[PDB]
């Protein structure tokens, strides 16, 4: 009943953060932790792997655009 | 069988055969038109 | 309709609504509808002017070789001396065509816009179908029906082909194509593309 933040599922997101490899990038939400003590509760998978070999990381909601 | 087809579609062998064919075409043109410097058609 | 390949399925691009459909696009050029329209108009104009040109090639040649007339070859008519010099008639052609063709293009971009002769307000135009203009073009009240558009397009395609043939055969020979036909009828085996190389 308390409205869970973050997009629902599968919503392609456009990254607003500047200091990530995927600035102006199109990723996919995989889950969002409903805990209001988090500081980066959304997590996004991509189809392009970055330099460190990783393909996932965290964000807040402000650095997201729920594109579709 | 299909395995050898997918293997043959791997870029090395495809590239080798393509380049061989292109080089053959070029050397045959050079044979049939020695030294071919200008465009003496128009 | 008549898929020119008794086994191949026609692509969705050429359904059969437009005249002369045979699914003849083995390279999938016009798979975008607006480009299909573009090439429809281009084929129309190319075929019409190709019919014109092939007539202007063939008929003068035979009427001259018949002794009834005397007129140079279509290629031998340039250097001929007329009442007007080349450049004069050429620039008149240029201005008149830069009027007519630009009006045609404006009609292409905008269906039913440039209709009236903007000089006088009556006498102007009945609304048309794109690629098939109205009254002042079809005075004999011919009904623009099927088997007319198909015949037009088929004759025009063959005319394009025949014109390219004229051009390349003049390139390889420089002679009158009807003379090539006479030599052909002499001996089709001794007279063909093979011997002339």
């Amino acid at each position: 009943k308390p409205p869970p933040r973050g997009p629902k599922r599968g919503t392609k997101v456009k990254i607003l953060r500047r200091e990530s490899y995927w600035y102006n990038g199109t990723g996919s939400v995989v889950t969002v932790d409903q805990d209001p003590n988090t500081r980066y509760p959304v997590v996004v998978r991509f189809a392009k792997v970055n330099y460190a070999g990783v393909s996932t990381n965290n964000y807040a909601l402000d650095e997201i655009k729920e594109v579709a | 069988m299909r395995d050898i087809k997918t293997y043959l579609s791997v870029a090395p062998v495809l590239s080798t055969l393509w380049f061989g064919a292109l080089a053959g075409l070029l050397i045959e043109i050079n044979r049939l038109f020695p030294d071919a410097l200008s465009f003496p058609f128009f | 309709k008549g898929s020119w390949l008794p086994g191949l399925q026609s692509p969705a691009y050429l359904d059969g609504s437009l005249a002369g459909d045979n699914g003849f696009d083995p390279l999938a050029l016009a798979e975008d509808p607006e480009d299909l329209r573009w090439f429809v108009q281009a084929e129309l104009v190319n075929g019409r002017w190709a019919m014109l040109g092939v007539a202007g090639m063939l008929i003068p040649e035979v009427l001259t070789k018949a002794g009834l007339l005397n007129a140079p070859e279509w290629y031998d008519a340039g250097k001929e001396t007329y009442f007007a010099s080349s450049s004069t008639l050429f620039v008149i052609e240029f201005i008149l065509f830069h009027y007519v063709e630009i009006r045609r293009w404006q009609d292409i971009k905008n269906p039913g816009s440039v209709n009236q002769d903007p000089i006088f307000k009556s006498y102007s135009l009945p609304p048309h179908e794109c690629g098939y203009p109205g009254s002042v073009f079809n005075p004999l009240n011919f009904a623009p029906t099927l088997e007319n558009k198909e015949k037009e397009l088929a004759n025009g395609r063959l005319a394009m082909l025949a014109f390219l043939g004229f051009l390349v055969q003049h390139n390889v020979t420089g002679k009158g194509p009807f003379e090539n036909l006479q030599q052909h009828l002499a001996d089709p085996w001794h007279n063909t593309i093979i011997q002339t190389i």
Partner: protein, 193 residues
């Protein structure tokens, strides 16, 4: 409209004499630029309109070439001529000085006044008879001036290109020559391509 079918861009809704909707480079998107262009257009057309007969009139009647009317300046002892009248002070320095002083002084005192309508259309003491009587007639003659002046500017472009392609000639001269024989005395000899 000047072009049928091509819709008029936003900032050309008629609303001004001469506006037949022609702006393919979109320079008029700026209001100040637009008014400045109108003013400069009026200046241009008005100058050229005054200054075409200053070429025609001499070229035909008792004068000579429109290029030799200034030939006095190329050589030292040149003195201008009024149809066959070398005025005592028609020398180079005095006309140069009056040009400088009059043009600069006046066009300053006139431009420095920002109505802004008076700039394009002075009036004032240049309308005491009231040829501004009829507002309909007003806009009509405005349109007329714009069109005639556009034509005059075209005419000057023609003068330039013609005197270029024909070194040392006269407009009326080339016109009479070409008309004298239609299909071989024209732009053709100039431009095959």
């Amino acid at each position: 409209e000047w072009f049928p079918g091509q819709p008029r861009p936003a900032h050309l809704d008629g609303s001004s004499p001469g506006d037949f909707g022609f702006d393919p480079l979109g320079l008029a998107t700026v209001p100040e630029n637009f008014e400045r262009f109108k003013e400069s257009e009026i200046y241009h057309c008005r100058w050229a309109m005054l200054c075409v007969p200053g070429v025609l009139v001499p070229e035909a009647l008792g004068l000579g070439n429109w290029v030799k009317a200034q030939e006095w300046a190329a050589l030292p002892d040149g003195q201008a001529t009024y149809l066959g009248n070398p005025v005592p002070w028609g020398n180079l320095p005095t006309i140069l000085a009056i040009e400088f002083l009059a043009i600069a002084f006046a066009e300053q005192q006139r431009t420095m006044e920002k109505d802004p309508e008076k700039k394009k259309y002075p009036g004032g003491a240049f309308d005491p008879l009231g040829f501004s009587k009829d507002p309909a007639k007003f806009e009509e003659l405005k349109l007329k001036e714009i069109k005639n002046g556009r034509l005059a500017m075209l005419a000057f472009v023609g003068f330039c290109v013609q005197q270029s392609a024909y070194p040392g000639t006269g407009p009326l001269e080339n016109l009479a020559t070409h008309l004298a024989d239609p299909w071989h005395n024209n732009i053709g000899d100039i431009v095959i391509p």
